[PDB]
Paper text:
The pattern III group (binding shifted to the primed side) consisted of structures of eight non-protected peptides that all bound uncleaved into the primed sites. On the non-primed side, the MPD molecule occupied the S2 site, and the CL- anion occupied the same position as the carbonyl oxygens of P1 residues in pattern groups I and II.
Addressing the elusive specificity of cysteine cathepsins, which in contrast to caspases and trypsin-like proteases lack strict specificity determining P1 pocket, calls for innovative approaches. Hence, we set out to determine the crystal structures of cathepsin complexes with representative peptides of cleaved substrates. As a working model, cathepsin V was chosen because of the resolution of diffracting crystals (up to 1.3 Å) and crystal packing with accessible active site cleft. Reactive site mutants C25A and C25S of cathepsin V were used in structural studies.
Author numbering: 1 to 221
The structure:
Amino acid sequence: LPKSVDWRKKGYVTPVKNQKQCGSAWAFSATGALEGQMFRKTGKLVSLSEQNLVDCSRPQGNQGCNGGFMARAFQYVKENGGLDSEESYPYVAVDEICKYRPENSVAQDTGFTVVAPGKEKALMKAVATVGPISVAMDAGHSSFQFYKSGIYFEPDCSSKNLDHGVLVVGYGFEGANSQNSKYWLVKNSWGPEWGSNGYVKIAKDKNNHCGIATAASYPNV
Ligand SMILES: [Cl-]
Ligand SMILES: [Cl-]
């Protein structure tokens, strides 16, 4: 596998978004992964609608602004036959009426693939060969709230009880040895003001820190 990967350098990632006061991180993680797969398939980077997901995927088991799961969103895109663009179905941060329009669809998936649970080596392989991957993590910590630089490592992090969906856009390492002080490059959905331009480096190969490889998945396009 590559020693480092950064899909943002290849045009697969949109600018950082902000979920505001709505528990829709799961939807932002989902669109970020679909945005990268659509980019890989067509060479066109188009911002997708997290609102489409919030308002229309309750049948798949999502709960709009009260939470959800990336696999359930990819399932919604599959069953639904499409997903509209951010431009056509804007984000308002509140649960609203489903207004999915097939004519404005700019993405589709035939389902999704799951990364073997708890396997950081497996997630590394998915990131290197597919593109950005949706992952769940335990972000309920003040240290995460106030993160700004460096490799994030929090003793209270759990690898099992997770509460936030994010996007792994690559991985790297500090220094010259590609074998130590490794980290996952993660895109958050709390605006570009949070963290480092909206991103955070999370400790990699430190026992599935914060559960990054516990429930990873990506849409099949
Ligand atoms: Cl959330
Ligand atoms: Cl999921």
